[PDB]
Structures are given as C-alpha cells and as structure tokens.
Design a protein around this ligand. Sequence first.
Ligand SMILES: CC(=O)N[C@@H](Cc1ccc2ccccc2c1)C(=O)O
Ligand SMILES: CC(=O)N[C@@H](Cc1ccc2ccccc2c1)C(=O)O
Ligand SMILES: CC(=O)N[C@@H](Cc1ccc2ccccc2c1)C(=O)O
Ligand SMILES: CC(=O)N[C@@H](Cc1ccc2ccccc2c1)C(=O)O
Ligand SMILES: [Mg+2]
Ligand SMILES: [Mg+2]
Ligand SMILES: [Mg+2]
Ligand SMILES: [Mg+2]
Lengths: 368, 367, 367, 368
Amino acid sequence: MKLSGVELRRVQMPLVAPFRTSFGTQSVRELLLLRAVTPAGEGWGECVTMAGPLYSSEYNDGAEHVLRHYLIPALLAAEDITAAKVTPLLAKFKGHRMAKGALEMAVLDAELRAHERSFAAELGSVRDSVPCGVSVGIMDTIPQLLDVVGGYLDEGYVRIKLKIEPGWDVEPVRAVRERFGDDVLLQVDANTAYTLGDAPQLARLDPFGLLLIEQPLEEEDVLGHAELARRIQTPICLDESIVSARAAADAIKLGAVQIVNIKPGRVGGYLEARRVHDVCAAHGIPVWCGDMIETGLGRAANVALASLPNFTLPGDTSASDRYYKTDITEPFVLSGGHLPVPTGPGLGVAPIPELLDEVTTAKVWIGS
Amino acid sequence: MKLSGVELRRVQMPLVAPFRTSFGTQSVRELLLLRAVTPAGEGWGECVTMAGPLYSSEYNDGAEHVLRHYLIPALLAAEDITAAKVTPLLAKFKGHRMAKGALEMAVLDAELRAHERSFAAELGSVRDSVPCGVSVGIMDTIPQLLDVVGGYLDEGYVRIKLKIEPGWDVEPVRAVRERFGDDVLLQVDANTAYTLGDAPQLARLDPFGLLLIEQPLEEEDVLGHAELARRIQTPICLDESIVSARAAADAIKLGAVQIVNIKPGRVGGYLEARRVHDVCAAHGIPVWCGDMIETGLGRAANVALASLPNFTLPGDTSASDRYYKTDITEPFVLSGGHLPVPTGPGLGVAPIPELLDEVTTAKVWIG
Amino acid sequence: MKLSGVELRRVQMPLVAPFRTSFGTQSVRELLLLRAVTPAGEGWGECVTMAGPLYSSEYNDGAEHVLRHYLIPALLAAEDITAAKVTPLLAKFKGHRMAKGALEMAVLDAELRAHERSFAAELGSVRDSVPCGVSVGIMDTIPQLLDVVGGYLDEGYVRIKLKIEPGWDVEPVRAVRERFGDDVLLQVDANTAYTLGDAPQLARLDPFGLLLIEQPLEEEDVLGHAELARRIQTPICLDESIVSARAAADAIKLGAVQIVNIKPGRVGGYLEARRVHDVCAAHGIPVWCGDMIETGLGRAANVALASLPNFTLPGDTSASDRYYKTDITEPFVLSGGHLPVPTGPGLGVAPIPELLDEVTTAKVWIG
Amino acid sequence: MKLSGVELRRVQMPLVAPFRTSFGTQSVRELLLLRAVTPAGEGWGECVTMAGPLYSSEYNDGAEHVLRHYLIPALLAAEDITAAKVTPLLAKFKGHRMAKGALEMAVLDAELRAHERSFAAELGSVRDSVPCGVSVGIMDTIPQLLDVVGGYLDEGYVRIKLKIEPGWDVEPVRAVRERFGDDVLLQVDANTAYTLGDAPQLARLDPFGLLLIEQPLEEEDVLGHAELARRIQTPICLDESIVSARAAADAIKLGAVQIVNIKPGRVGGYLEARRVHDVCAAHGIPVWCGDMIETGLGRAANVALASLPNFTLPGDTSASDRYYKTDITEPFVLSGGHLPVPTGPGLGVAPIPELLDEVTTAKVWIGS
Ligand SMILES: CC(=O)N[C@@H](Cc1ccc2ccccc2c1)C(=O)O
Ligand SMILES: CC(=O)N[C@@H](Cc1ccc2ccccc2c1)C(=O)O
Ligand SMILES: CC(=O)N[C@@H](Cc1ccc2ccccc2c1)C(=O)O
Ligand SMILES: CC(=O)N[C@@H](Cc1ccc2ccccc2c1)C(=O)O
Ligand SMILES: [Mg+2]
Ligand SMILES: [Mg+2]
Ligand SMILES: [Mg+2]
Ligand SMILES: [Mg+2]
C-alpha cells in the first residue's frame, strides 16, 4: 500500500449546550479530519486536539503544521506502508501524539477497508454493544446541575461523571447523591486542577462512594498521585498522564493509578490504545474508554475499542446527540444504555458528503 | 464465521538427527494438526505438545482428548465465532493452553484467509525477514558438540543455544568459547534441570559472557529465579514459567526475568503471544521467538510473530532442514542468517497433500 | 513594567563544521530571537528550539506560532509584569517550555537592565569565570575523531564529551582513551538512542572511567534509567528527561540520575533553571550547564548560570568560535580553559546591529 | 561593594501582653539589629535570637559575640561582596545560622537598595498581599484563652495557632472548637515539648480537624517524627528541625513532615529560605511563613517572602500591634485579614530614628 496523499480538513461543529471543564468553557468544537488516499481506497482519521493548548500541549494549528511539514511527508516518502509501520516511520519526531494518532487512524481505516475488516475485529472485540456513561460539565448553580443529571439518567445513561475544580467539588457531589441516591454510578474528573496540598479537600469526597477521581493533579506528577492515593479513599484514575503503554506500566508499578482512562489520540493512536488495554489487563487494572467530543468517525472507532474485554467500567462514549444536533455520519443512538458496535469494513461509518461540506471551514491537500 | 467442523490428524516426522534435552532424547516428532472448516474455507492449526508430559503437563493424547470432548464442541455450539472470541468461549476449561492455542491458530488462519490478510499483518510485523539462531542438544562427547556447532555456524546461523544439565554445563560452554571465540552469540537452556542449591555451579558460567540462561529452575519457581539472579551474572530468561501475559508481568515485577522466550502454544495461542510481547516491551524486557520443532505451518506463524518490534534477540526458528529432510509445506530455507516472513493470506503456507498423507498416522472428523 | 510589544526575529547562522548527534547532522543553526520592549527599555531572549522536532517536541515554527498567538498576547493583556510573574501568567498553556523560557529571558533582561543588575547577580553567582568543556559529534572515521579531539584539547578545553549511538560507542571511547590517556575528563551523550535491552553494550563502557553517560534512554523512561544504573558502572546523567525542578526531584528519588545537565530553555527559563540547581544541591546531586548552540545572547546567560555554586563539573558552554565564525554579540573567547562571567546590566551583551541584520531572515512585531 | 563596617544595636521592646510557650513566658522582646554600611549605602538586618538558649542553642549575647569576633570581620576582609557570597565567605564557621542570617539580611538590603530593587522582587513575589494568621500562647485558664481567640477572630485574622504542652493540649483545642466551630482554621505548636511516648495523648487531637501539629518532638528527632506520623492523624509540621534546604529534603524523604514552617533566621537567611521554599515546592510540600516577634524590619522581609507561590497556608506574620504598641518602622496593619507586600527599594521600610533611639539600650561599631 502506498500513501498517495492526504486531504486535511478543518471542521467546526456547534455543541448543543456549552461544556465547561476546569480549563474553560467551549460552545463550539473545532477539529481536524484526515482523508488518506491510497491506490486501493480511502480512510478517515480524526484528531482530538482543541483550538488551544489547554488540555495538553497539542492544539489544532500545531497538529496541522506538524502533519503537513513532517508526518505526512514521512509517510508519503515510504515505499510500502501499513498501520503498524506508521510508528517506526514517525519515531524520529518527538511527541505530537494526537497528530500521529489521527494519521495512523486514517491509514488503518484505509488498510482495513481494503481487507473488508472492521476496527472491532482488528482490535479484538468480544461483544456487540457497550454500556455508556456521560460526562457533565461544571454549571453556575446546583439546581442546574441536578436538572442536567436527571435528564441524562432519564435517557438511560448508566453512569454519571462530574467535572470538578476548586470551589465545585464536594457540594455538587453531595447534592447529586442527595437527589439521586447511593446506587447511581458516580465519579469525578478534575482535569489537573488540584495539587497535593489539596489532599484534605479531596478527602472530603470519601463518604460519597465515588468510583474514582480522574486526574486530580498535573500530567507529569505521577509520584504525587501515588502520595495522594495514600491519603484519600476515592480510587485514582489517570487520563492526561497515560501517554503510552509504558507510561501506564510505570504509573501502575509506582502505585499511582487503580483505574485507567484510555483515549486513543492521547496515546498516539488505536494500536497503542490496544497495548494500553493489554498492559493494564495484565496487571489487573480496569480500563474505560475516554471521549474527546469526536464526530461519528472517532466515536465509531472508540465504540469498537470499548468492546475489548478489559473495558469493565462504562465509558464516556455518549450518543452523538449528547454533543451534536447533526453528526457528519449516521448518528450513534443510545439503546437501553448501550451503543452498538459498528459492523462494516474499517470504521463502519464514513462522512455524509453533504453534511461534511456544511461544517468544513477549509481544506488542503498534501501530496508528493 | 460459523465453524462447520475440525479435522484432527496425527502426524509423525522423523528428525534428521536425535535431539537430546535435560528431559530426554527424541528421534521422531509426533504432533497433532487441526484443519478447521468454515463455509468460507479452511484454516490450519498445529499443537506443540509432545508424546509424553516431559516438558509440561500437556501431551498429544491429552490434547486430542480435550479438543475432541470439550474445546471443539464448545466452538461448534457457538452462533458466531472469531479468533478473539475463542478465549472467552473456552475460558471455563482450566489450563490446556497448547490445545487451545492450536485451535485458535486454525480459526485465525481461516479468518485471515477470508480477508486476504497475512499473520504478519494481523500481528503487526515491522520487517520482512528475521535473524535465526539454532538450538543444539546435549551430546555424548565434547568433540561431537564442537563439530555440530561448527556446522551450524558454517550454515550462517547467527546465534548458538546449548542445552545443558547437571554434568554438562561449564565444560561444553568452556569448549565452545575456546574453539569458536568470544564474539559468537552464545546462550544455554536447562529446561528446569537445576535447583537454587546449584547456584554455585551456575555461577561458574559467569566468565563466558553468555547472553542468558534459559529456565534453570522449575516452571512454578518464580521467586527462586529472582533469588538465583542475585547470585549469578548470566541474565535469567524464562520459557516454561511464562504461561500468559499476566505471568510475564508478575515475573518481571518480582525480578525473576530479564529476557523472555515467547512460544505461542505455551501461552494459549498467537493472540496471547502478542500480548506477552507488548507487556514485555512496556517494561523494557526484550523477547525472542521460541521453537517446538514445528512443521512449516507453526514455523510460518512463528516467523511472522518474530518480526514484531520487541523481538530484538535472534530466535530459535531454524530452517526446516535443521529438523526435517522433507517438510509438509514449502520449506523454510536460511538466507544470510535470516528467514523470510511469509506474504500470502493466513499463514502464507499450507500442507502439500501428498507429503502430508505420507506422514499422517490417523485422522478424525469432529462435526 | 508594562510590556509594549515583542519583536520576533528568525536568524540563520552557519556552523564552522557540521555537527552530528544520534538524531542527525546539522550544518546551519536556525533560531528565534525575541526583543521585548517596555517603556524603560528593551531586553533580549533566545529560543533553543531547532528547525524540526528531533531533540524534543518543540521546534522553531511551532514556538513562533505559540508565542505569537498565545504567550505574547497573554503578557500584553497583563497590567503589571515581572519575570517571576511570567510563569503564572502563562501556566494555563500546557508545555511549550522552550518558548516560555525565551520569553521569560527577554522580560528578565529588560527588568534587570532597568535595575542595572547582571544575570549573574540575580541568579547568585559565586565566581567570575567558569571552566568549559566541549561536545564533539559523531564522525565518519576514528582518525577524524582523534584529530578533532586533539584540536580542542590544544585549545585548552578542560573536558571532552562524545556524542554516541548504536555502532559508535565503545570504539570511539576506546580510541580516545588510547590516544589521549586516562587523565582526560571524558563523558558520552546518546541523546536517547538506546533501550534497556542495550544494557550489555553500554556495560562495555565500564573500563573506560567515564564521568557519566548522558541520556542513554528516551525522555519519558525515568524508571528504565534507574534500572540501567543498576547494570552499568558509568554514572547516569539526564538532559531531555529533566523538564522541571519537580522532574529532577522525582528522578533523584527514583534512583534514575546521579548528575544533572541544566538547560534553561528546556526547563522553561532561567528562573526554573535556578530552582533545578537548588533542588539538585539539596539532594547532593552535582549539576553542569548544557548548551544548545546559542548565539552570544544565550551563551552569556548560560555562563552566568554556570557560575552558581553546585555547578561542580565543567559545562558545555564552549567559546563562540567552536560554532560560529562571527557571533552576533562580542564573542566569548576561551582563556586558560575558562570563560569570563559577564559584568554589565542584564545579559551583559547585546546584538551588534549590523551583524544581526546580516543573519536575520524575517521579523515581525507583536504589539 | 565593600562592607565598611557594621553598627550593631541591642534593642528592647515591651510586648502588649506576655507570650507563653512550652519553653516559658516572655513579656519583653530583646533583639539585635545590624546596620551594614557600604560606600553605596546602608542596609538593615535583624537577628531572631532571644535572650537565652531556650528555643535553639543561639541567643543574643552569643550571636553578638560571634558576629563581632568572626562573622563581621570575615566580611570586612573580603575584597568584593554580594549577598550570595556571604555564604561561602562564612562557611568555615560552623552553625550560628540566626547570626549569619541577620548579617546576610543587612548585606542584601544594602545591595538591593543600591539597585532600587525590593526584597519581594528579588525573592520572586507573585502577589501583593498575604493572608495572616496569629499565634496564641498558653493561658492560665480556658475562659481567658477563648476571649483572646475571639478577639483575634474579630480583628479578621484568618487562622488560629495555639501553643501547646503537656497539660494544655486536648482541652484547649476542644474548647476552641466548641466555642468557635469546625470551620475556623486551627493548628497547634508544641515547640518540642513531647516525646514519642506521648503519641497516645497526641492521637486524642485526631477528631478536631487540626491543619497540623507543629514540632511535637525535639529538633534532632527526625525519624521519631516519621514514626509519630504513622500513629496520629494530625499532619506533622516541622519548625526547629528545618535548619536548611538539605534538612527539608531529608525530612521529606524520610516521611517526617507534610507541611514546613519557613523562618529565615533559623535557616541562615532569606536566600536559604527561598531555597527551602523551592525544595519543598518540588516535592509537593506546602510551606508557610514563621514569625519570631520581629520589628517591622524582619516583618517587612517576611511579608515579602510569604508572597512567593508555594506559601499556600496562612503565616504567623501578624500586624505589628499584635506584639508592639509602637513599632520602630511604619507599622504593619491588617486589612481584610491581609498584610500588604512592601514596595520600595530593599526591605521597603527603615527605622524611624527617634523611635529606634528610644528602644536602643546599647550599640557598638565593628569596623576594620
Ligand atoms: C467527555 C470529557 O469530559 N472529555 C475530556 C475533556 C474535554 C472536554 C471538553 C472539550 C471541549 C472541546 C474539545 C475537547 C474537549 C475535551 C476529558 O475526559 O477530560
Ligand atoms: C528448539 C528447543 O530447544 N525447543 C524446546 C524444547 C523442545 C525440545 C525437544 C523436543 C523434541 C520433540 C518434541 C518437542 C520438543 C520441544 C525449548 O526451547 O525448550
Ligand atoms: C552541545 C550539545 O551537545 N548540545 C545538545 C544537542 C544539540 C545538538 C545539536 C544541535 C544542532 C543544531 C541545533 C540544536 C542542537 C542541539 C545536547 O547536549 O544534547
Ligand atoms: C509566633 C510564634 O509562635 N513564634 C515562635 C516562638 C517564639 C515565641 C516567643 C518568643 C518570645 C520572645 C522571642 C522569640 C520568641 C519566639 C514559634 O513559632 O515557635
Ligand atoms: Mg478526563
Ligand atoms: Mg526452552
Ligand atoms: Mg545532551
Ligand atoms: Mg513554631
């Protein structure tokens, strides 16, 4: 398989309601999509960067620059490629994992389509649907939060995740537990907003039976997470820190993590995400599938990946309409709290050309 | 894919020379092969059990019994199957890893043939040929050993592995190093023949620069290997102990192993073998591909597996004629110390019917 | 101090000889310079990124983009600024340390110029000159290497650092020691080129008495470095892994590092570099000053930083003419193996406008 | 800069109310001040020793003797000096940290004044005011204590620290919590008055939610503090034991301390105090600013130092009138629970000559 070129698109999609995390509020999702072109067929990739470097150091214009000037040219110059060979072909470039993972995703989709093989089959799926949670942002008031949570519960979502930050942690958790009870699956996510000095405040979450607290400290503070685990009862989950399978093995050995959130872009693609799942399984560490507000393309791949055997807690892969009035693929629709795993070749979905054109703000071709 | 049935064949293949390990001498290889039949087509699996339970608890008649009475009927009762689903469909049956791995291998070959996809592509190959070592048995005398070793080096094998046991360790090593020099890649394999009380004898291997000593102690003695590693300079490699990816992670965490031999049948199949490779890579532990004297069917799958990126030491996947005058597939032929990775769909090879019929001693259809 | 604006300039400076590391060969240095303008006066900053992301994830076009669209506008929106406040004003932007450090450097130079205070005084200098080593690249042949090394020793450099990679480690070291003897201060730098599986090869460096081996493994592999240190005799030094004072403390606690290379841009600026120095001193870990082939602006700041008390091994801050026929400031000239610490306000040097204009390929004003 | 001489003064300042710790009651503060004289200008330093060696081995007459006969002469003999060079110039003399820190403070103030640079700027301030607690002594009765605490709370102090000792620990803490509630920030300080054998008594503080227990055991017993931490719930803070940045790193590695009190004189001066702050920050250990009942000179420097970023708990730098009816500088006045960081050159304050003369009991010049 030779890669002939890539068409890179910038896409903008308004959210049905603004989404607030500890790093800010977003009301529109801006993203990059990649259409890889080979003599045997096309494939689609999606990048999970945001507009600015608020979640990690990567962001849309940076990922676009590196794809255009380093990563795509390296794959174009290669005589033969496969998705597994993308990693060594790009190894000389440091970091840029989300960008590399998007490009890998496109290459894999093209390769798999040519063999009439689904992402699910390639990744090792063992079931045909997955249970889905939802991630709920920070609100201006507690009554708004309780209405939003009760709405999701009425749609049949099986687990609630709350964004937290200093000033919005113990009270929202208490209120949710009072309104909805002790049997709801509940967890929280700080997106790096605390320090080890906040351990007393985080220990105040102890009586609420949370499944986990996701990424309370900064990305690089692995040892600090292991020290926090010794002071709080809520199990520690890591997101931003888990940049690779080796990083997962490290964090596990250090006592820094009991449960791991797997996001394929964050680790440099779907193939490394599978290795993360396998390393965690081999150490008895449960995983769940993370979500970066992807279009149906990324959502489809994520639903496939979430059907592997060590994904034993509900993921953040919500239905398309949690975020988007109109998706660019056929939409993912919740059914009895589950999403169905896609079945055709590759991702199992592709953009509806008319809907994609409507949300495309620019595109560029990168050829030889 | 619905599994229609499986044919189980018993095959006997004489070796070009008898092969002696610490558990005995074998002059013929007796093995079981599986042909899985689906409405798409067929796939071939090979079991790595021997005649008796001398290497591990599994052996040919046992594997055949469990396949016929438990494992194959479980897959036949399933609505849909895929190679990845073989593991949960069989998880209620404890152990029997070599038997399960053979069945998974047949399923995976059928599945991959239907998608026109090679084992190499499915497993994540990054290169199109692999460097091959050879495993040399215990001999009656040191001069014989030196003739056999020189012969393999003249064929271009890139590394020499010597089988060892009490009474045949330090002297054969010393002689090989004196004859052939310090630059030859050299390692030893005890197949569980020592105890922790033999540590002083194994420490006598220290001045010879061996790459590793493979499985000096028994399969279950993971802690003992970690204590041995504190007393000897030669790095520890595990084979028999590594029964799964979890067992690899455990052994690594305990300090019991620095290098891991991966045998797909021993771990329950090619899919778990990949997971073993990935768990070792994540901990910085090099792997290399083991060999159970397979026909070209298993050899083909193994060459594919050995082309993954963390396989950074030469494997035991020798050319077909190290073992067999006539293989049942197109033979693997060493070239510049390497074997080429197969390219067609599935395994990339299949039995030549006339040659297979010639070495087949029994067969049965399980539908 | 209110920041009025920043000029960003792109500069290209040919090297007097090509410089080869494990990540490739560079014959020209392309860099970004910043001129921060305040109502008091001006200050100069220099970014240590290269053209592409081969040493770390940051590179010139990337750093320029993030400075223009995020970092400089954040400082322009602030009411009052000081160099110490640059860090919290930019903390919401993840990573981008070399870019932030360049901007901090310009701010700090403007601020210190206004108080008539040198970098050396602000950072806590305890001496007025520093002993300098040199970093020597990989060569095509061993005789070339020996000519280049003898040349630097004849200039009076007090220590030799060799770039190494697989295929160029033990032999060049052995040759340097044979030619120049056991009393020369000698160390090696892999720039991440090895894995833990190469430990036996790196252990072959043991008999040569190296001061250290710098960053043998990848940037994120802190645990792997601690495991390597248990297998080899040469002390481990980290460069790429040391991205902050916290990262230094972590690496030290884990047993991953015995000696630390401090590069101000790599850690996010001169103020964090001081904190790295102080954290290492509190744990008994020696530091030395790294070099990114800076112009006289960065070289000046680095010589100042290298005069702090825990810098007890010779740095890589070579004289200007190790790299450049004509520097853009008054050049640094070795004297008795030392460079003098600058004495005026700020950096103590500034660009000679004619020489700067000559190597400037682009510039833009961000107001 | 050459140091030409130092004028050393003994000063006596009556306290507005006697102050009782585990080592005794003091009703007057006796202290040493230093006026360093250089051709470019003067600088002020203040020593934190007391009259007798009850808090540490250093005391006023001893610090005066060592300054006059060893430390000042060593700096006078030096060709050129800077505050950073004070440490190596004095390294040959063992110990005497408070004395050395006073001399360093004067030299630094003189150097910074000459560059028109504040202590805040030199030390790395990131904010222009700091939240202040108060330290409250041992009283003869519980009702007196409760009146004193309620008075400070009415002045707007943000945190209460109680001196404790055998016979005055659990009861005063219980009474404070009963009167003032669970939300007041509360901590205790033993000044070395307990042994490891008192662990059961100290564990009886567990239900009161104290932020910390400061220096329960003797200065040299670092390992003992780590063992006590395994038996009590109240986090351990160290004061007397933290004599340097290396001592802080040691105590942290041994598990002996979760929170560190920084006193610049105790560690040998403001420059080492900054290194203490940075070492603790790098290990995720919060710090707060200690107080030795300084005049406005030491108070000004301490308020500057307390504005650095890892000072995340309220310090003991109370307003001047917590101790003194009339300070020797313009006084520090609490405003909304905070003190403002000084802004001019050096310390930002200097003695009012008339007020200083009134409280000066003796002075001596040490010249070449
Ligand atoms: C479902 C969830 O909480 N996702 C991310 C955060 C995230 C949040 C908001 C975003 C807005 C625009 C673009 C990317 C975003 C990523 C997380 O787990 O941390
Ligand atoms: C190449 C190598 O040394 N193989 C195995 C052992 C092995 C040895 C001999 C056998 C003889 C007949 C059947 C199966 C056998 C398996 C090992 O690595 O331990
Ligand atoms: C003096 C030394 O070895 N420097 C760096 C690497 C480095 C090397 C080469 C470069 C070439 C062009 C631009 C930046 C460069 C940075 C190091 O210590 O790892
Ligand atoms: C505010 C506080 O509690 N300070 C010191 C103790 C202290 C107490 C009383 C003193 C009386 C005269 C001179 C020096 C003194 C120092 C401490 O933290 O341990
Ligand atoms: Mg998250
Ligand atoms: Mg073996
Ligand atoms: Mg380096
Ligand atoms: Mg105290």
